[PDB]
Write a protein that binds this ligand. Structure first.
Ligand SMILES: CC(C)(COP(=O)(O)OP(=O)(O)OC[C@H]1O[C@@H](n2cnc3c(N)ncnc32)[C@H](O)[C@@H]1OP(=O)(O)O)[C@@H](O)C(=O)NCCC(=O)NCCS
Lengths: 4, 150
């Protein structure tokens, strides 16, 4: 889960 | 019963829908535009021809290394513990095994994601760091960095  | 398929302009809306439901954090139009340009680094998972999961990766050049970063890897909750996540992860592992130039695979999960820790640790991944306030508007904001050395 990338944090953008 | 589980099949992986390519992400194309024909099914990219189905991918955005899955990520919206599975992941509490929202992704911009550029994220999905880039997903169509990575090739085998992005797949949909089908359970009996229904799209129920997806995996999106990108090549990362950090720490003087060539790394494969898993941005999203998820499955719809009612279809969990059927091997869909394993099918998607083995696909990324196989690509890296055949490519031979990646030093490691890594990703971020919330420190409360016990099922994600359990899943990745079964594949040889280790928590190598815990980043405070990694996520911005969700709780917990802290994230573990999971990595598998190749
Ligand atoms: C993590 C996730 C992708 C796993 O997907 P999945 O399809 O349920 O995983 P699988 O069915 O292939 O599980 C494989 C193995 O991982 C472990 N595992 C997966 N979920 C687990 C859980 N909830 N509790 C304990 N172990 C678990 C088990 O060893 C499992 O094997 P088993 O079913 O034979 O015991 C899923 O929980 C999910 O989609 N989570 C939401 C999004 C997310 O957090 N993604 C991770 C960040 S990339």
């Amino acid at each position: 889960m990338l944090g953008p | 019963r589980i099949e992986l398929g390519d992400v194309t302009p024909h099914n990219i809306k189905q991918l955005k829908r899955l990520n919206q439901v599975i992941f509490p954090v929202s992704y911009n139009d550029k994220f999905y535009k880039d997903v169509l340009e990575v090739g085998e680094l992005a797949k949909l998972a089908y359970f009996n021809d229904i799209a129920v999961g997806a995996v999106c990766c990108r090549v990362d050049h950090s720490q003087n290394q060539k790394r494969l970063y898993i941005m999203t890897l998820g499955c719809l909750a009612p279809y969990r513990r059927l091997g869909i996540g394993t099918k998607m992860l083995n696909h990324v592992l196989n690509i890296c095994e055949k490519d031979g130039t990646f030093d490691n695979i890594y990703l971020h999960v919330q420190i409360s994601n016990e099922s994600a820790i359990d899943f990745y640790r079964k594949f040889g991944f280790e928590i190598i760091e815990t980043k405070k306030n990694y996520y911005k508007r969700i709780e917990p904001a802290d994230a573990h960095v999971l990595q598998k050395n190749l």
